[PDB]
Amino acid sequence: SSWIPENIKKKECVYFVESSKLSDAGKVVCQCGYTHEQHLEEATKPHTFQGTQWDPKKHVQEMPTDAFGDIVFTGLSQKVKKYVRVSQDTPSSVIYHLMTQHWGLDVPNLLISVTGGAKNFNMKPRLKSIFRRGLVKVAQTTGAWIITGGSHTGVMKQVGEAVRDFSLSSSYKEGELITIGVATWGTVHRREGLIHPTGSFPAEYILDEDGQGNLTCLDSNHSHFILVDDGTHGQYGVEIPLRTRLEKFISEQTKERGGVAIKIPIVCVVLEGGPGTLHTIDNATTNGTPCVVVEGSGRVADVIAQVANLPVSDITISLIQQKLSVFFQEMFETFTESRIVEWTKKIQDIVRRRQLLTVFREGKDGQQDVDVAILQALLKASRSQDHFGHENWDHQLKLAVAWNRVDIARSEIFMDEWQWKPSDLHPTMTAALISNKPEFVKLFLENGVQLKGDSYHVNARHLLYPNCPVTRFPVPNEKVPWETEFLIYDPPFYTALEPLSTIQYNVVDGLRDRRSFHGPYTVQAGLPLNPMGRTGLRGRGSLSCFGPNHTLYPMVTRWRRNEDGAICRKSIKKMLEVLVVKLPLSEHWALPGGSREPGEMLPRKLKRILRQEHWPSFENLLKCGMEVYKGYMDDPRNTDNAWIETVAVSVHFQDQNDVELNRLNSNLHACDSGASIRWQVVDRRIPLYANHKTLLQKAAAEFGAHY
Ligand SMILES: [Zn+2]
């Protein structure tokens, strides 16, 4: 295939910096890890002088790849395995197209992810056996893919051992399961021979792990390899960001059965691990991937399992250090102060996402293979999921009946916080009949299936500031207020200095109205101080100006009629319908509002990109109604010197046929320029931004509706 060097890139360094190190057995390399002798071709040439500093974003550039083919190991396995050298920023849409039809990989039905320890790992004889049986049983059925880092060390090798065993002893024989290995190109020992500008496909890879020094050897039982590159040598952890994006894309943005979308189930299992495992778990849970932690594995598994049920407030700095000096004993001397306060924020973030985290207890709980824990995680993540509706949870039940677990399917039926209708069990009963399992059909037909701790700003203290490759300083819930001393505080200053005087803070400084609703706020030097605590950044970021940013997000409401005009009281209480809008390229709807333009009186988005030639009328009507909230939101764009403040005016229509009040509003509400407009029912799982669902929850209780 020659589609590569055409659609897949690799990264290199253009000039050498001469960093002051020795890099084990060597005399300086550049700053990257590669020696001046082999550091491309024009780096040693004096291409003028770009300075004396190293910045990755500045002088690393993409090039067509030269490392892809069919690796065949020397003598331990005479087989063919496909591999490719992708870069760090290749979009997660050409990688899927490369896997589907350039290797011959069919669409999977499960996306198991295995993360854990490396170069420091020793399973107990019983943990190894239970993990082997569970993984073999789970991968034996369905079409599961096993995403795992590729190297000949630790759990990444002891997963390949089980794959090899199941592929050597099987009725269908050969290999019926697909195990993908994503690793970092820099940390590969014998990279030579694996690089050819056109492509070879013997790609012989002699495996020696005696003189590896510091570079891990590639595994020899995985089926496919995706080696990411960043232009760096000997630096692990590059593959952590790309792996989660690819997993999310394959899980929720590739299947189109039923005409809308389907989320392919995905789970991430944890077996021990270190610094690189906590980051992977945080990234996966942030994207929405369920995580299961095997208790007893050690060093990350015990640490996260021992605080998996405690309230987020009491997980403090000194609580980590007490649980970080028993599982990390030889490595405790490495642990510094600026790194413990980072291991704490990540653990707090993982714990507070309690709907995407299960713990596989060892002795007296889940006393079976890991499939029970996987089922529990999938069924708990499908019920608390936001975008895909009630039709998504209907298929993990089918997976459960495929795995012969009847107690797990019984638990979902009898849950008091899950409103399921009786005709919603057909896709599971259909599979129960096919598989000849009387237990499930007997369970179903019985249930009417007749045939005929602390409250601080959370999103403001969120990693990965939007639309920027920057990171915030880790600020745990303990030390967010501006009074508590945080001596390590050294946050970045990203803002898409110091003569900022003549700014009348706490007053209407010209046509800006810099007046916070939560009383007067303080100023440090020439910049304000964020109320409600710290964020982890500084400056202003992607915001108008320092201080409070004012907006006028409205909400509009009608009672949910169905067919007759009587208020359609639902199964529990009244439900009401909110009118929302969608951005042209976004995964969430938004409330019909925005910034208050000077002298506009309308929030610049109900006034533009929306209905026109009627602004004065509804403007004279909007100023009649009860406010439900006024002030600061937990918006993810906040910083230590800038924030967003809002007014929430609720307008309500009692009658659907109330003359032109609702008819003219509905008949005229047409963007004619924008992407899409719609109405939505107000439930606890509406796909809005969290800042908007907060207003919905705080205002739907003012009319008697059920959120
Ligand atoms: Zn370099």
XYZ file of C-alpha atoms and ligand atoms in Angstrom:
708
model
C 0.000 0.000 0.000
C 1.279 3.451 -0.968
C -1.499 5.401 0.791
C 1.060 6.047 3.568
C 3.869 8.532 3.053
C 0.837 10.312 1.540
C -1.611 10.605 4.459
C 0.511 9.767 7.546
C 3.207 12.026 9.012
C 6.301 11.737 11.212
C 8.080 14.353 13.308
C 11.722 15.457 13.376
C 13.887 18.192 14.904
C 15.364 20.753 12.529
C 18.324 22.128 14.532
C 20.332 20.918 17.542
C 20.190 22.821 20.821
C 23.209 21.259 22.660
C 21.477 20.517 25.984
C 23.754 20.017 28.987
C 23.478 16.269 29.642
C 25.378 13.064 28.869
C 22.511 10.604 28.264
C 24.005 7.473 29.866
C 26.861 6.217 27.619
C 27.225 9.288 25.428
C 28.658 12.791 25.089
C 25.656 15.184 24.662
C 22.976 14.519 22.079
C 20.963 17.641 21.281
C 18.106 18.135 23.742
C 15.969 15.483 22.028
C 18.018 12.353 22.667
C 19.465 11.927 19.162
C 23.167 12.557 18.529
C 24.442 15.328 16.262
C 25.842 12.574 14.033
C 22.306 11.361 13.179
C 20.130 14.422 13.769
C 18.801 14.751 10.191
C 20.941 16.658 7.667
C 20.591 20.445 7.943
C 20.692 20.624 11.754
C 24.493 20.537 11.820
C 24.460 23.125 9.038
C 24.157 26.674 10.428
C 20.701 27.693 9.178
C 21.314 31.181 10.612
C 20.653 31.104 14.398
C 17.113 30.832 15.795
C 18.436 31.684 19.272
C 19.536 29.489 22.190
C 16.220 28.094 23.488
C 14.290 24.875 22.844
C 10.571 25.083 22.059
C 8.878 21.939 20.701
C 6.060 23.868 19.019
C 8.491 26.080 17.110
C 11.013 23.870 15.328
C 9.647 20.330 14.953
C 8.022 19.680 11.573
C 6.058 16.830 10.031
C 7.413 14.656 7.224
C 6.151 11.619 5.301
C 6.831 8.449 7.235
C 9.308 5.690 6.454
C 8.497 3.026 9.091
C 5.528 0.837 8.136
C 5.222 -2.721 6.893
C 5.091 -6.314 8.131
C 7.462 -7.140 10.991
C 8.553 -10.775 11.150
C 10.464 -11.801 14.260
C 13.696 -13.757 13.970
C 12.974 -17.235 15.296
C 10.463 -17.028 18.128
C 7.432 -16.562 15.846
C 7.278 -17.066 12.069
C 4.218 -14.906 11.446
C 3.301 -11.577 9.850
C 2.384 -8.526 11.940
C 1.494 -5.090 10.585
C 2.852 -1.822 11.963
C 2.908 1.890 11.141
C 4.753 4.965 12.442
C 2.230 7.739 13.039
C 3.029 11.153 14.484
C 1.524 12.737 17.601
C -1.074 14.960 15.887
C -2.393 12.736 13.091
C -6.201 13.083 13.195
C -8.141 10.151 14.594
C -9.988 9.689 11.301
C -7.241 8.541 8.898
C -5.938 6.036 11.453
C -9.344 4.357 11.546
C -9.453 4.343 7.739
C -5.964 2.799 7.731
C -7.042 0.071 10.158
C -10.331 -0.743 8.418
C -9.174 -1.084 4.802
C -5.460 -1.067 4.726
C -4.896 -3.954 7.190
C -8.220 -5.773 6.936
C -9.659 -5.017 10.374
C -13.425 -5.408 10.683
C -15.641 -3.175 12.834
C -15.310 -4.342 16.461
C -17.990 -4.845 19.088
C -15.812 -4.143 22.152
C -12.791 -1.934 22.820
C -10.996 -3.357 25.860
C -8.109 -1.158 26.996
C -5.330 -2.591 29.167
C -3.023 -0.241 31.069
C -0.642 -0.972 33.914
C 2.983 -1.387 34.937
C 6.154 -1.557 32.872
C 9.733 -2.644 33.629
C 8.594 -3.004 37.270
C 5.881 -5.626 37.564
C 5.246 -9.023 39.146
C 1.785 -10.586 39.182
C 0.877 -12.882 42.027
C 0.331 -16.473 40.824
C -3.415 -16.135 41.500
C -3.897 -12.645 40.046
C -2.149 -13.747 36.850
C -4.463 -16.759 36.534
C -7.694 -14.858 37.224
C -6.711 -12.085 34.804
C -5.806 -14.660 32.148
C -9.110 -16.523 32.439
C -11.151 -13.317 32.509
C -9.412 -11.751 29.514
C -9.604 -14.982 27.504
C -13.321 -15.385 28.268
C -14.099 -11.762 27.389
C -12.066 -11.702 24.166
C -13.267 -15.160 23.093
C -16.763 -13.873 22.321
C -17.905 -10.783 20.403
C -15.373 -8.928 18.250
C -13.393 -7.258 21.006
C -10.253 -5.259 20.275
C -7.499 -5.234 22.889
C -5.764 -1.851 22.938
C -2.528 -2.160 24.902
C 0.896 -0.570 24.938
C 3.358 -2.635 22.953
C 6.535 -3.757 24.712
C 8.116 -6.894 26.156
C 7.638 -5.863 29.802
C 5.007 -6.132 32.502
C 1.274 -6.411 31.905
C 1.884 -5.384 28.291
C 3.778 -8.680 27.909
C 1.554 -10.814 30.146
C -1.457 -9.877 28.025
C 0.386 -11.097 24.930
C 1.209 -14.306 26.779
C -2.506 -15.000 27.301
C -3.255 -14.045 23.689
C -0.580 -16.492 22.515
C -1.975 -19.242 24.742
C -5.553 -18.752 23.519
C -4.337 -18.636 19.916
C -2.327 -21.853 20.352
C -5.223 -23.706 22.033
C -8.530 -23.007 20.285
C -11.172 -24.929 18.358
C -11.190 -22.366 15.544
C -7.416 -22.157 16.160
C -5.044 -19.548 14.648
C -5.987 -16.063 15.913
C -9.616 -14.942 16.090
C -9.014 -11.900 18.321
C -7.304 -8.632 17.439
C -4.754 -7.108 19.835
C -3.502 -3.654 18.850
C -0.267 -2.350 20.314
C 0.196 1.428 20.511
C 3.585 2.562 21.807
C 6.107 5.397 21.524
C 8.535 5.245 18.607
C 11.324 6.909 20.576
C 11.544 4.134 23.173
C 12.199 1.241 20.784
C 15.544 -0.530 20.993
C 16.208 -1.853 17.473
C 14.518 0.803 15.373
C 16.985 0.232 12.535
C 15.731 -2.035 9.782
C 12.203 -0.950 10.691
C 12.646 2.262 8.655
C 12.453 2.182 4.856
C 11.317 5.119 2.706
C 9.094 3.058 0.382
C 8.268 -0.124 2.333
C 9.751 -3.612 2.634
C 7.473 -6.124 4.442
C 9.974 -8.548 5.784
C 10.717 -5.920 8.446
C 12.915 -8.321 10.434
C 13.198 -7.344 14.110
C 15.886 -9.170 16.088
C 14.834 -9.151 19.749
C 17.648 -8.566 22.247
C 16.818 -7.148 25.683
C 20.251 -7.539 27.294
C 21.931 -4.364 26.049
C 18.750 -2.327 25.667
C 20.087 0.142 28.240
C 17.025 2.348 28.620
C 14.910 1.574 25.520
C 12.123 -0.985 25.795
C 11.954 -3.835 23.308
C 8.796 -4.310 21.266
C 6.498 -7.174 22.218
C 6.265 -10.274 20.041
C 2.683 -11.508 20.550
C 0.632 -8.437 19.605
C -1.007 -8.382 16.184
C -0.767 -4.730 15.092
C 1.483 -1.846 16.133
C 0.896 1.917 15.983
C 4.145 3.635 16.982
C 3.651 7.345 17.691
C 6.507 9.786 17.134
C 7.327 13.172 18.635
C 10.921 13.750 17.511
C 12.191 12.785 20.973
C 14.457 9.896 21.960
C 14.019 7.877 25.136
C 11.032 9.847 26.479
C 8.043 7.668 27.350
C 4.411 8.727 27.649
C 3.916 10.321 24.222
C 1.189 7.833 23.260
C -1.084 8.680 26.193
C -2.953 11.593 24.516
C -3.346 10.011 21.071
C -4.582 6.660 22.400
C -7.587 8.158 24.222
C -8.694 10.227 21.212
C -8.520 7.184 18.939
C -10.387 5.050 21.471
C -13.146 7.655 21.811
C -13.486 8.037 18.037
C -13.717 4.282 17.504
C -16.152 3.909 20.417
C -18.697 6.655 19.755
C -18.174 8.066 16.251
C -17.937 5.181 13.761
C -21.156 3.102 13.826
C -24.289 4.243 11.984
C -26.833 1.468 12.536
C -30.389 2.653 13.065
C -29.865 5.935 11.224
C -28.506 8.100 14.052
C -25.461 6.617 15.877
C -24.405 3.824 18.239
C -21.769 3.866 20.984
C -19.611 0.740 20.824
C -18.937 -0.365 24.430
C -15.460 0.457 25.735
C -13.771 -0.300 29.065
C -10.307 0.302 30.529
C -8.788 -2.158 33.014
C -5.993 -1.266 35.440
C -3.276 -3.620 36.699
C -0.729 -1.815 38.922
C 1.042 1.002 37.034
C 2.897 4.161 37.992
C 3.055 7.810 36.931
C 2.035 6.986 33.363
C -1.060 5.040 34.413
C -2.715 7.787 36.473
C -2.484 10.145 33.493
C -4.003 7.525 31.175
C -6.863 6.892 33.613
C -7.539 10.618 33.965
C -7.561 11.063 30.185
C -9.827 8.056 29.611
C -12.318 8.974 32.340
C -12.424 12.583 31.131
C -13.398 11.433 27.633
C -16.095 9.203 29.128
C -14.464 5.773 29.051
C -15.446 3.507 31.971
C -12.497 2.481 34.133
C -12.214 -0.658 36.266
C -9.441 -0.942 38.860
C -8.209 -4.376 39.939
C -7.785 -4.124 43.706
C -4.593 -5.678 45.048
C -2.457 -5.035 41.961
C -0.479 -2.292 43.643
C 0.960 1.217 43.434
C -1.900 2.798 41.487
C -4.627 0.196 41.835
C -4.598 0.094 45.629
C -4.216 3.877 45.803
C -7.282 4.539 43.627
C -9.302 1.669 45.144
C -8.758 2.835 48.735
C -10.245 6.279 48.003
C -12.824 5.212 45.418
C -15.749 5.779 47.810
C -14.522 8.588 50.073
C -15.994 12.061 49.490
C -13.884 14.257 47.235
C -13.305 16.830 49.993
C -11.381 14.618 52.429
C -8.971 13.336 49.773
C -6.243 15.752 50.858
C -2.512 16.194 50.330
C -1.590 14.431 53.569
C -4.040 11.591 52.923
C -2.248 10.745 49.674
C 1.163 10.828 51.364
C -0.072 8.290 53.927
C -1.289 5.983 51.135
C 1.692 6.827 48.908
C 4.351 5.636 51.393
C 3.052 2.058 51.725
C 2.580 1.036 48.081
C 5.460 3.257 46.876
C 8.244 2.448 49.324
C 11.395 2.264 47.191
C 10.119 5.171 45.067
C 8.920 7.395 47.931
C 12.264 9.217 48.003
C 11.628 10.312 44.408
C 8.227 11.802 45.315
C 8.645 15.549 45.855
C 6.208 18.191 47.112
C 5.376 19.714 43.705
C 4.525 16.213 42.431
C 2.341 14.972 45.299
C 0.056 18.010 44.876
C -0.214 16.853 41.264
C -0.923 13.198 42.094
C -3.715 14.499 44.368
C -5.647 16.666 41.901
C -5.742 13.856 39.331
C -6.979 11.357 41.924
C -9.645 13.813 43.095
C -10.799 14.343 39.506
C -10.959 10.586 38.900
C -12.866 9.968 42.138
C -15.422 12.741 41.610
C -16.311 11.097 38.272
C -17.956 8.335 40.280
C -20.207 7.212 37.403
C -17.197 6.119 35.307
C -15.174 4.224 37.917
C -15.649 0.720 39.311
C -13.346 -1.282 41.577
C -12.863 -5.036 41.140
C -12.780 -6.200 44.750
C -10.703 -9.304 45.355
C -11.896 -11.509 48.208
C -15.597 -11.264 49.093
C -16.975 -9.400 46.057
C -17.182 -10.146 42.344
C -15.625 -13.526 43.082
C -15.483 -14.447 39.390
C -13.676 -13.377 36.249
C -13.320 -9.702 35.345
C -16.323 -9.967 33.014
C -18.706 -9.210 35.896
C -16.834 -5.991 36.677
C -16.728 -5.097 32.976
C -20.493 -5.609 32.689
C -21.132 -3.528 35.801
C -18.953 -0.692 34.490
C -20.595 -0.707 31.050
C -24.139 -0.829 32.449
C -23.391 1.951 34.949
C -21.763 4.171 32.313
C -24.631 3.660 29.841
C -27.257 4.745 32.395
C -25.392 7.947 33.358
C -24.493 8.837 29.768
C -25.760 12.027 28.181
C -25.697 12.076 24.367
C -26.956 8.676 23.216
C -30.470 8.195 24.541
C -32.321 5.347 26.246
C -31.692 3.130 23.199
C -28.010 2.744 24.139
C -28.428 0.967 27.487
C -30.610 -1.579 25.645
C -27.618 -3.344 24.061
C -25.221 -3.815 26.951
C -28.073 -5.927 28.319
C -27.742 -8.007 25.149
C -24.015 -8.261 25.836
C -24.807 -9.395 29.391
C -27.170 -12.119 28.192
C -24.385 -13.115 25.800
C -22.051 -13.483 28.800
C -24.575 -15.644 30.730
C -24.791 -13.265 33.725
C -28.400 -13.089 34.921
C -27.877 -11.331 38.255
C -26.358 -8.314 36.499
C -29.357 -8.101 34.147
C -31.704 -8.476 37.128
C -30.039 -5.545 38.908
C -30.707 -3.139 36.022
C -34.402 -4.063 35.831
C -35.077 -3.336 39.520
C -33.300 0.037 39.771
C -35.298 2.916 41.257
C -33.354 5.721 39.520
C -33.733 4.221 36.027
C -37.061 4.873 34.284
C -37.457 2.015 31.815
C -40.691 1.301 29.881
C -41.873 -2.318 29.508
C -41.655 -2.387 25.699
C -37.963 -1.425 25.932
C -36.637 -4.962 26.543
C -37.261 -6.410 23.068
C -33.631 -6.122 21.801
C -32.493 -8.195 24.802
C -35.302 -10.765 24.754
C -34.660 -11.327 21.045
C -31.078 -12.351 21.842
C -32.220 -14.372 24.865
C -34.487 -16.532 22.689
C -31.791 -16.983 20.031
C -29.188 -18.207 22.530
C -31.636 -20.702 24.116
C -31.380 -19.333 27.660
C -34.709 -19.885 29.475
C -33.560 -17.975 32.568
C -33.537 -14.572 30.876
C -36.839 -15.019 29.035
C -38.443 -16.199 32.284
C -37.053 -13.128 34.051
C -38.330 -10.795 31.334
C -41.827 -12.165 30.696
C -42.489 -11.854 34.432
C -41.819 -8.101 34.313
C -44.683 -7.199 31.964
C -43.226 -7.861 28.504
C -46.474 -9.266 27.056
C -45.944 -10.571 23.538
C -49.150 -9.860 21.599
C -17.895 16.619 50.259
C -16.932 20.118 49.140
C -18.559 22.478 46.635
C -15.866 24.496 44.868
C -15.694 25.550 41.237
C -14.914 22.395 39.254
C -14.936 23.213 35.535
C -12.879 26.344 36.182
C -10.161 24.091 37.638
C -10.141 21.760 34.643
C -7.083 20.525 32.770
C -6.687 21.145 29.015
C -7.945 24.703 28.705
C -10.255 24.877 25.657
C -8.798 25.606 22.213
C -5.226 25.747 23.506
C -2.433 23.211 24.176
C -1.823 24.525 27.704
C -2.174 22.941 31.138
C -3.245 24.457 34.445
C -1.309 24.093 37.674
C -2.814 21.301 39.826
C -4.947 22.932 42.517
C -6.707 20.432 44.806
C -10.034 21.257 46.429
C -8.243 21.762 49.752
C -6.251 24.818 48.667
C -8.530 26.631 46.199
C -9.494 29.605 48.450
C -7.291 32.670 48.150
C -6.629 32.797 51.912
C -5.020 29.369 52.320
C -1.278 29.531 51.662
C -0.212 27.529 48.594
C 3.556 28.012 48.464
C 4.061 25.915 45.309
C 1.687 28.110 43.264
C 3.310 29.002 39.929
C 0.590 28.985 37.277
C 1.005 29.802 33.574
C -0.142 33.074 31.989
C -1.963 32.032 28.821
C -4.155 34.729 27.264
C -5.166 34.627 23.599
C 2.009 43.911 30.691
C 1.665 45.891 33.997
C 0.696 49.374 32.630
C -2.972 48.383 32.956
C -3.772 51.324 35.252
C -6.743 53.709 34.997
C -9.127 50.736 35.241
C -11.958 51.527 37.673
C -12.575 48.064 39.071
C -15.711 47.407 41.162
C -17.462 50.256 39.289
C -18.812 51.062 35.813
C -15.479 51.930 34.209
C -16.786 53.543 31.044
C -18.924 51.262 28.888
C -17.793 48.004 30.487
C -19.636 47.676 33.855
C -16.891 45.881 35.786
C -19.101 45.186 38.811
C -19.239 41.652 40.199
C -22.585 40.503 41.577
C -20.849 38.852 44.565
C -19.797 42.082 46.236
C -16.611 44.048 45.612
C -13.625 41.958 44.547
C -9.945 42.550 45.272
C -7.173 43.519 42.863
C -3.584 42.242 42.892
C -1.134 44.637 41.196
C -2.881 45.592 37.920
C -5.062 42.469 37.704
C -8.123 41.266 39.651
C -8.378 38.125 41.760
C -10.850 35.407 40.822
C -13.588 34.980 43.449
C -14.674 31.553 44.707
C -10.987 30.568 44.766
C -8.155 29.806 42.363
C -8.254 28.109 38.963
C -4.699 27.143 38.013
C -4.051 29.708 35.284
C -3.589 33.478 35.180
C -4.238 36.269 32.706
C -7.549 36.447 30.883
C -7.493 33.658 28.316
C -10.179 33.449 25.633
C -12.275 36.161 27.265
C -13.129 39.785 26.548
C -11.324 41.556 29.395
C -10.094 41.088 32.945
C -12.697 41.159 35.678
C -16.297 39.957 35.445
C -17.561 39.211 31.944
C -21.296 39.852 31.733
C -23.808 37.834 29.695
C -27.602 37.503 29.628
C -28.381 33.823 28.907
C -32.203 33.554 28.750
C -34.407 30.472 29.008
C -37.761 29.920 27.294
C -40.304 27.319 28.359
C -43.567 25.686 27.341
C -45.534 22.841 28.886
C -45.081 19.484 27.145
C -48.258 18.901 25.158
C -48.565 15.583 23.363
C -51.682 15.348 21.172
C -54.783 16.749 22.908
C -53.857 20.139 24.387
C -54.156 18.971 27.985
C -50.919 19.317 29.941
C -49.326 15.909 29.381
C -48.439 14.939 32.931
C -45.646 12.375 32.726
C -45.174 9.169 34.714
C -43.806 11.086 37.713
C -44.566 14.807 37.377
C -44.893 17.545 34.778
C -42.168 17.923 32.169
C -41.522 21.120 30.222
C -39.738 21.738 26.923
C -36.810 24.141 26.553
C -35.797 25.751 23.257
C -32.062 25.337 22.646
C -29.657 26.035 19.785
C -26.673 24.160 18.372
C -23.363 25.465 17.096
C -22.419 24.392 13.547
C -19.574 22.185 14.848
C -20.218 21.185 18.467
C -21.198 18.121 20.480
C -23.591 19.989 22.802
C -26.598 22.243 22.438
C -26.474 25.720 23.962
C -28.960 28.016 25.643
C -30.201 30.751 23.261
C -28.001 33.540 24.571
C -24.549 35.059 24.747
C -22.723 38.333 25.387
C -24.560 41.598 26.038
C -23.351 43.913 23.293
C -23.104 47.565 24.443
C -26.580 49.042 24.116
C -28.054 45.896 22.542
C -30.122 44.567 25.495
C -30.169 41.191 23.720
C -27.514 38.510 24.197
C -25.980 38.864 20.723
C -27.124 35.357 19.734
C -30.842 35.701 20.248
C -30.307 38.962 18.332
C -27.991 37.555 15.633
C -27.745 34.103 14.015
C -31.402 33.883 15.034
C -34.789 35.400 14.247
C -34.802 38.970 12.952
C -37.134 41.931 12.361
C -38.781 41.274 15.735
C -36.090 42.239 18.260
C -37.837 45.374 19.666
C -41.082 43.450 20.285
C -39.629 40.546 22.264
C -37.244 43.055 23.867
C -40.291 44.900 25.220
C -41.661 41.493 26.251
C -38.433 40.047 27.691
C -38.428 42.666 30.457
C -41.316 40.917 32.227
C -40.478 37.819 34.248
C -38.748 36.411 37.319
C -34.988 35.993 37.507
C -33.771 32.636 38.785
C -29.982 33.154 39.046
C -27.627 36.144 38.837
C -23.860 35.912 38.924
C -20.803 33.740 38.404
C -20.891 30.382 36.618
C -18.540 27.407 36.827
C -17.439 27.952 33.238
C -14.357 26.037 32.010
C -12.851 29.208 30.487
C -12.303 30.998 33.807
C -8.853 31.984 35.063
C -7.418 33.558 38.211
C -7.989 37.077 36.829
C -11.106 36.659 34.664
C -14.515 35.029 34.967
C -18.017 35.012 33.486
C -21.146 36.392 35.161
C -24.671 35.805 33.908
C -28.316 36.756 34.352
C -30.941 34.020 33.970
C -34.365 35.421 33.066
C -37.023 32.730 32.629
C -39.888 33.395 30.209
C -42.816 30.989 30.337
C -45.851 30.385 28.117
C -48.907 28.956 29.862
C -50.917 28.065 26.739
C -49.696 26.671 23.432
C -52.635 28.331 21.642
C -52.159 31.651 23.489
C -52.725 33.844 20.424
C -49.463 34.953 18.813
C -47.420 34.689 22.029
C -46.157 31.171 21.275
C -47.279 30.781 17.652
C -45.515 33.900 16.348
C -42.453 33.074 18.448
C -42.315 29.557 16.996
C -43.245 30.521 13.428
C -40.634 33.300 13.349
C -37.801 31.510 15.198
C -35.799 30.556 12.111
C -32.113 31.359 11.771
C -31.988 31.244 7.939
C -28.233 31.738 8.415
C -27.338 29.426 11.294
C -26.859 25.682 11.391
C -29.696 24.207 13.456
C -32.404 25.109 15.987
C -34.589 22.747 18.021
C -36.726 22.021 21.087
C -35.746 19.633 23.871
C -37.418 17.950 26.842
C -36.040 18.891 30.258
C -34.682 15.748 31.906
C -31.561 15.160 33.975
C -29.792 13.772 30.878
C -30.309 16.613 28.393
C -27.185 17.033 26.166
C -26.420 20.610 27.200
C -23.283 22.141 28.663
C -23.024 21.533 32.403
C -23.205 25.280 33.073
C -26.555 25.297 31.266
C -27.911 22.152 32.916
C -27.141 23.846 36.242
C -29.498 26.693 35.320
C -32.059 24.187 34.053
C -31.949 22.314 37.369
C -32.125 25.561 39.375
C -35.085 26.933 37.386
C -37.223 23.876 36.569
C -37.989 23.649 40.301
C -39.686 27.071 40.150
C -42.627 25.710 38.122
C -43.037 22.218 39.581
C -41.447 20.232 36.751
C -39.278 17.148 37.339
C -35.633 17.440 36.290
Zn 17.175 17.876 18.701
